[PDB]
Amino acid sequence: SMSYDIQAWKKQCEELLNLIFQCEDSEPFRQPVDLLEYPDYRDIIDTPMDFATVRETLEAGNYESPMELCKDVRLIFSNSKAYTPSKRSRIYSMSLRLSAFFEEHISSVLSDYKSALRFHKRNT
Ligand SMILES: CC(=O)NCc1c(Cl)cccc1Cl
């Protein structure tokens, strides 16, 4: 049950996504870039990602671990850095702040999960 629960990350990620949706800094990243509206986005970005898509992937059970979820979130930020590379851009600054917030909060989720894995493997 509760110590080393290998499923506890799911609720922890739901809670973190809730915080992220509350942040004004997430506003550009909540929904997919409108590919019909914004022409050259696909010329630049191979794999779009956004927080609504991550939140639905989680709700759907399609992440095997919090590291898979983290990979998709990191793609949100790497896509922004590629599309909006200037340190002068306020959008760049938003992405930087929100990335730092995410990386701060996800740290403990991943470490806790990996510790759970190691314990269960050791005692299996
Ligand atoms: C999510 C993201 O990279 N948005 C940047 C953007 C802005 Cl600010 C304005 C028009 C189109 C785009 Cl794609």
Side-chain angles (χ1 to χ4, degrees), residues 2-34 37-123:
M2 207 81 231
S3 293
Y4 296 138
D5 172 9
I6 68 184
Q7 305 300 340
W9 72 272
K10 301 169 171 175
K11 188 166 161 178
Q12 292 169 7
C13 290
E14 203 161 344
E15 287 174 338
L16 181 51
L17 291 167
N18 181 290
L19 296 180
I20 285 159
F21 274 87
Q22 289 180 47
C23 291
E24 299 150 57
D25 290 343
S26 70
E27 185 287 321
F29 311 106
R30 294 171 189 154
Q31 286 277 296
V33 172
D34 195 319
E37 285 304 303
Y38 290 113
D40 66 349
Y41 190 76
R42 295 311 312 272
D43 294 330
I44 302 309
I45 295 304
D46 235 56
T47 307
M49 189 48 58
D50 63 281
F51 284 110
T53 295
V54 169
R55 182 176 66 181
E56 176 59 19
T57 304
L58 177 70
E59 179 51 40
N62 303 320
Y63 288 127
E64 293 181 79
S65 67
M67 296 81 77
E68 295 199 339
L69 176 147
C70 183
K71 182 170 277 288
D72 275 347
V73 171
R74 287 174 174 167
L75 181 52
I76 298 170
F77 299 119
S78 69
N79 284 348
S80 181
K81 185 174 214 167
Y83 194 76
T84 309
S86 178
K87 289 140 174 50
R88 265 177 293 178
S89 162
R90 71 191 68 188
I91 298 306
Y92 176 107
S93 285
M94 288 171 73
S95 179
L96 201 78
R97 290 194 295 271
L98 189 73
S99 181
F101 179 90
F102 176 75
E103 293 286 347
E104 173 63 26
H105 285 86
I106 202 69
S107 177
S108 76
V109 177
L110 298 167
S111 63
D112 285 1
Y113 177 79
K114 291 176 189 170
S115 290
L117 286 186
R118 280 192 289 279
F119 169 89
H120 291 295
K121 192 161 176 189
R122 175 175 180 188
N123 297 293

